[PDB]
Amino acid sequence: PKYLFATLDKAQYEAYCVKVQARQKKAYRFFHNGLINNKLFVAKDKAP
Amino acid sequence: VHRMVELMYVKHEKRWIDPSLKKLTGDFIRRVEERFTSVEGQPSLLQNYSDLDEPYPAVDRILAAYPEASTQLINA
Numbered sequence: 664p665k666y667l668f669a670t671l672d673k674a675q676y677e678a679y680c681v682k683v684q685a686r687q688k689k690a691y692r693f694f695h696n697g698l699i700n701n702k703l704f705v706a707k708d709k710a711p
Numbered sequence: 712v713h714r715m716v717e718l719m720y721v722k723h724e725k726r727w728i729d730p731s732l733k734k735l736t737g738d739f740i741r742r743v744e745e746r747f748t749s750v751e752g753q754p755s756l757l758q759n760y761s762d763l764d765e766p767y768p769a770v771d772r773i774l775a776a777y778p779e780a781s782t783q784l785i786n787a
Binding site for chain 2: 691692695696698699700
């Protein structure tokens with residue numbers, strides 16, 4: 664991965680890193696909810 | 712843990728709305744400890760609820776002993 668990031672400016676890469684870490688926090692939340700309530704998989708019922 | 716203190720301990724009067732609620736805030740703190748320790752032996756940093764009497768000064772001490780407790784959200 665590092666090698667891809669070396670295409671960017673510290674400007675860009677660091678902007679991305681803030682995005683990522685926010686996602687992880689959502690993810691983390693979801694995963695724990697799922698484990699407990701058996702909803703790691705959620706079937707969609709209707710198209711968008 | 713912070714919002715707990717914020718909403719149950721009156722700052723400008725240096726008092727808890729009720730000892731019970733100081734216990735509460737204390738117990739949850741104890742929990743966060745547990746969540747973030749993973750070897751037997753280590754004792755609690757909050758050893759007596761007396762510690763929470765002047766809370767905001769002491770609390771930060773404990774919370775800082777368990778770094779990640781400021782990185783990740785509560786377990787479900």
